[PDB]
Every structure is written in structure tokens, then in C-alpha cells.
């Protein structure tokens, strides 16, 4: 995250850290006790699928304070329409091997209904993005979880204001074009969380952008509202052997 602030410990309780062989891979969002939403592109280069770990209740990566909860990732589900190395359909649904325990520091973000998300949440201007990604373009990653308030743009306005992948119906733009504030590498997969009448909802996934905080460009987020029914169906399904599952979309 570029130009944000430290998320006070426990105020981003749905944030997930994904690790591979103990190394920082990506962010994610807890949506109930066994299910995490992340970005498909986070898994393009995974060699050992059995060493993926999700950490909940993380805050300061330099210390252990006892609020952290680690779980093996039992399943990574990716839409059939996602092509590795490209930007469209950038979503993954992760099943944990064992549920996390909900606590003051571990709480799921609500996955909204589609209609609610499209008709109401999509018009809330500002939303929060968070992660342990790079604090600057070409810079070091954060040791404390960072958070940033970003405004959403209509895709026609994003394309007009921006000056190379297309912005599809499965994406949206948010952030700033003045190079001050943005998500960045390392934040991929993390939440874009939207507040409405006292409650927070998952509306986007940190996906991509032209560098980070690049003048004339905005951050691009997976439009989660397109995947609600796909996610809901998968969460009712029984696990299959093997970690990676490609599932038909729609």
C-alpha cells in the first residue's frame, strides 16, 4: 500500500496473509470460518501446492502476539475463464483445512448478495484497501498491515482519465491518478471493503495496475459482484482431492 496508514491492530480483522514456504505471497479476505477470497494470479507460479498457508489475525510480521491463526490451504478454486499470466477473471476461492476461530482479531467480511452489490455498494464512493505489500513502487514491503481509503470510478471515467490490458466488466478502477496513493505489488488478493449502514462488505480484490501510484493510472480491482453466485455454489460443494480446482464460470 502506497500513501496509506497502519491499520490499527484488529481494525482489519478479515485480512488474510498468504504464505508459500513461509514467504509472503499475497493477501486475501476471510468471508466465513473456512473460506478465503484471493486473486487467481497469486497462484500462477506455485510449484508445491501443499505448502500454502493462510494466516488470520496477523498485524506486525516482526512479532508473534498470540492472536495469529495459521491454517493450511486445502483447496484453491479458480474460474475456468482465468488464463495464467493475464488480468481478466482474477479471483480465487480458498478452502482452509480447518476453520479459523472467530475472535476480536479474526472476523469475516460479509460477501454481499449480487443485486445489493450492483445496485447499492457499487455507488458508495470510498472503500478500504489493505495489505502488507510494497510501501512504494520499487520499494520494500510493509511489516505492519497498511490500509488506504480509495474512491471508485465508473469504467468509462477510468478509461477517459487514464493516460495495455482492457478494463473488462469483471474489473473496476479505484484510487488516484496523481501518484500519491495506491495499492501495490504484494497487496494482490487483499480486500477492497465497502461500508454501508454499519456493516462492511467485499466489493473488490486487489488485482493489478500500471506500476503502482503511477501518474495517470488507477489501481484495478476484480469486480466481486460478478462472482457471487459462482462463489456461493462452490461454498456448498464437497472438497475434491488435489489442491487446485478449475471450476466452470459462469
Amino acid at each position: 500500500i502506497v500513501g496509506g496508514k497502519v491499520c490499527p491492530k484488529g481494525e482489519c480483522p478479515w485480512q488474510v496473509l498468504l504464505l508459500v514456504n513461509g514467504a509472503q505471497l499475497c493477501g486475501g479476505t476471510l468471508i466465513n470460518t473456512i473460506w478465503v477470497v484471493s486473486a487467481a494470479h497469486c497462484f500462477d507460479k506455485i510449484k508445491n501446492w501443499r505448502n500454502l498457508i493462510a494466516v488470520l489475525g496477523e498485524h506486525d510480521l516482526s512479532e508473534h502476539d498470540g492472536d495469529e491463526q495459521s491454517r493450511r490451504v486445502a483447496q484453491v478454486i479458480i474460474p475456468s475463464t482465468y488464463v495464467p499470466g493475464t488480468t481478466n477473471h482474477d479471483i480465487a476461492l480458498l478452502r482452509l483445512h480447518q476453520p479459523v476461530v472467530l475472535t476480536d482479531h479474526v472476523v469475516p467480511l460479509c460477501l454481499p448478495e449480487r443485486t445489493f452489490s450492483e445496485r447499492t455498494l457499487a455507488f458508495v464512493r470510498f472503500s478500504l484497501v489493505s495489505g502488507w505489500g510494497q510501501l512504494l513502487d520499487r520499494g520494500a514491503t510493509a511489516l505492519e498491515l497498511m490500509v488506504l481509503n480509495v474512491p471508485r470510478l465508473m469504467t468509462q471515467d477510468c478509461l477517459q482519465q487514464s493516460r495495455s490490458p482492457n478494463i473488462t466488466e469483471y474489473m473496476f478502477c479505484a484510487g488516484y491518478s496523481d501518484g500519491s496513493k495506491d495499492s501495490c505489488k504484494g497487496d494482490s488478493g487483499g480486500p477492497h471493503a465497502t461500508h454501508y449502514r454499519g456493516t462492511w462488505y467485499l466489493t473488490g480484490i486487489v488485482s493489478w495496475g500500471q506500476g503502482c501510484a503511477t501518474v495517470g493510472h488507477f489501481g484495478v480491482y476484480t469486480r466481486v459482484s460478478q462472482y457471487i453466485e459462482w462463489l456461493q455454489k462452490l461454498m456448498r460443494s464437497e472438497p475434491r482431492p488435489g489442491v487446485l480446482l478449475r471450476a466452470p464460470f459462469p
Binding site: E11, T103, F116
Partner: protein
């Protein structure tokens, strides 16, 4: 009332029904109040609420 305008007055989810009808609904871990629009938690850790801030204003 219609769900496209003002969320149909619902705090959370809204369904249109045939005629001038509307039903509000709540996420798992919440129940709908008798006003027919408001949602109240039914569990300790409902989704989308931040416990340390909920206690900070409780």
C-alpha cells in the same frame, strides 16, 4: 418501495415481489427487526463488524 432506489429502505438485502411488495433480508448471523428493514447481530462475531470498535461505542 423498490430495491433499486435507496436499497428499498433495507439495511442489508432487498427482494422485490409481485405488486407493490418488498422484503428485506439479513446476512447469516443477523436477524431482521420488526420494522422490516433493520438487521441486528445474533452471534458474537457477525460478518462485517469490527469488535474493538463495536465495544468502543457500546
Amino acid at each position: 418501495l423498490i430495491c433499486v432506489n435507496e436499497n428499498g429502505g433495507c439495511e442489508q438485502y432487498c427482494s422485490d415481489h409481485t405488486g407493490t411488495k418488498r422484503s428485506c433480508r439479513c446476512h447469516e448471523g443477523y436477524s431482521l427487526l420488526a420494522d422490516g428493514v433493520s438487521c441486528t447481530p445474533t452471534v458474537e462475531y457477525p460478518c462485517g463488524k469490527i469488535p474493538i470498535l463495536e465495544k468502543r461505542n457500546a
